[PDB]
Write a protein that binds this ligand. Structure first.
Ligand SMILES: O=c1ccn([C@@H]2O[C@H](COP(=O)(O)OP(=O)(O)O[C@H]3O[C@H](CO)[C@@H](O)[C@H](O)[C@H]3O)[C@@H](O)[C@H]2O)c(=O)[nH]1
Ligand SMILES: O=c1ccn([C@@H]2O[C@H](COP(=O)(O)OP(=O)(O)O[C@H]3O[C@H](CO)[C@@H](O)[C@H](O)[C@H]3O)[C@@H](O)[C@H]2O)c(=O)[nH]1
Ligand SMILES: [Mn+2]
Ligand SMILES: [Mn+2]
Lengths: 302, 302
């Protein structure tokens, strides 16, 4: 199965693979009643976002019913450059105005549930350098085929998550939810899920949103509702070791909470070397949230 | 305090620093009755070990009462090259013959308790490229000064643990034992402890030995028994991402166990890309142990 896989191949819970022999035109006919929304979380991506949107543009009005970019309060020219790419911009404020704004990616995705209409929601990051046009078709594929799959996770390859995936998320999963050891990229920003699922689960804060979702899906619906799809090659912003430490802490906090383990709520305090010889250390404490958002069905029922 | 630190500076639990104004000759007079043993764990280090031993050689017969290299079953010429460096070689077999051998670094250090005699034991890794001669004096310093310190941990700087320290150990500590957030390098192979402490605590398997020790020390004796000392510059073997994943898993397993959290015992399964395009994946499952060794006082009481 994993001895030969092509960009598009689907893996089911029961160690079974499937090669997709359809087109964008074929999947659209397999919809019938069900609608697809694509959401792009964005916090200052004025350089990359244009190219991201253009790859998805031809899908709109056909397969994709609506393309939405969720603005996490960008201070640069992201808001104006997204419109010029032919995308609809919805900020956190207008996505759900009657609930106060909280920082983090988890919020953005949670708020986008209220902002979107589609029966199926697809998330794609807006910092992707050259995304392949077939990304969205590949993610929706396993959902349109009737069997009871609610969450589609993607796996990718670095060109010629990263470290945090391989050292934090995956080993911790092996320790706490061993069944999810078959997930290759648990913290993948590119994934698709049905509204029925998304609106019934709580949404983890910050960078904990993905791993929270994965575990929540597995705990309620079992492994049989989760599928994996090969995308091929992924590339985005190169995060410094300092940032990765913070993200790890949030991934830990989110995963520990989903497993009924009390997390301290104490932020990761880092010690960055000042001078060349490491003569002194600058103390840096990243914030960590243990506050989930309630299932959207509790706030604004579809 | 951390605004200006020199190689040798000691940090106490109560956020207090001390600059060591003594020599190797001065500390030796401050011993009186108490003895020091230095242990070097070694599993195939035939290139580095000679240089490691030579740095510690002049301390023997004076400050260091005995220098012991604990052989973890090296297949190369480590066993013969260690003797030629003027070091005493004790394998796992002869360190404690009446207990069957288990693989991993944790075993090596546990067995070395039975093999060593000193009231104070100092551990230094044998894969260190150019260790500073003052390493051992710096580690024993806070122990010889009477106040109730039982474990001395070192911090270092990369030249011009690594990732696992910063992404796994430290954030997880912040989550589970928040007080140990002030520890800079929790997985440091260079450290010193009193026999009274070492023989009363269980010894974690594999690369979990250090973090297990740190937590066990903190849980029983509190933060007041743990001190930190600057060493300056450290360098060793550059471990590939695959290995680091395994180590992380063991660090997690060990830390989770010390916190009364049940670990699955399921090994981390990794997916390494085969070809250039990542056309297929090779499945690789590292072993993980949840088996501590009992306190040495239970096996061979000093
Ligand atoms: O407060 C925020 C922070 C980020 N983002 C957006 O989310 C996407 C991914 O953010 P990024 O910081 O680049 O994620 P990474 O640091 O690379 O972390 C990786 O792993 C995370 C943990 O699951 C995922 O959330 C990410 O998609 C994935 O890229 C980007 O388009 C951002 O604009 C927001 O909308 N709001
Ligand atoms: O089964 C083993 C494995 C290793 N070692 C020795 O232990 C030392 C450190 O091993 P290494 O694999 O180089 O450690 P790292 O992968 O670099 O891990 C870092 O972080 C670990 C987690 O605490 C510490 O054990 C290490 O000292 C520290 O170098 C070396 O002298 C080895 O010869 C053994 O004696 N037996
Ligand atoms: Mn990114
Ligand atoms: Mn090493």
């Amino acid at each position: 199965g994993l001895r030969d896989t092509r960009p598009g191949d689907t893996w089911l819970a029961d160690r079974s693979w499937n090669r997709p022999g359809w087109t964008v035109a074929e999947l659209e006919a397999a919809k019938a009643g069900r609608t697809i929304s694509v959401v792009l979380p964005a916090l200052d991506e004025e350089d990359t976002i244009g190219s991201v949107i253009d790859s998805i543009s031809p899908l709109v009005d056909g397969l994709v019913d609506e393309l939405i970019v969720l603005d996490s309060g960008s201070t640069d020219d992201t808001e104006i450059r997204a419109v010029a790419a032919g995308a609809r911009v919805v900020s956190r404020e207008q996505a759900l105005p009657e609930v106060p704004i909280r920082p983090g990616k988890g919020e953005a995705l949670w708020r986008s549930l209220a902002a979107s209409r589609g029966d199926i929601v697809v998330f794609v990051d807006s910092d992707l350098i050259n995304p392949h046009p077939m990304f969205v078709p590949w993610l929706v594929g396993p959902l349109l085929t009737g069997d009871g799959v609610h969450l589609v996770k993607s796996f990718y390859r670095r060109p010629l998550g990263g470290r945090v995936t391989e050292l934090v998320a995956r080993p911790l999963l092996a320790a706490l939810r061993p069944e999810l050891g078959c997930i290759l990229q648990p913290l993948g920003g590119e994934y698709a899920a049905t509204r029925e699922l998304l609106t019934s689960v709580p949404f983890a804060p910050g960078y904990g949103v993905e791993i929270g979702l994965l575990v929540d899906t597995f705990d309620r619906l079992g492994l049989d509702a989760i599928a994996q799809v090969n995308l091929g090659v992924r590339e985005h912003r190169n995060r410094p070791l300092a940032e990765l430490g913070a993200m790890s802490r949030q991934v830990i906090a989110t995963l520990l909470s989903r497993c009924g383990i009390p997390d301290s709520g104490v932020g990761l305090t880092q010690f960055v070397a000042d001078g060349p010889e490491g003569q002194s250390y600058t103390q840096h404490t990243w914030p960590v949230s243990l506050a989930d958002r309630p299932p959207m069905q509790a706030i604004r029922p579809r």
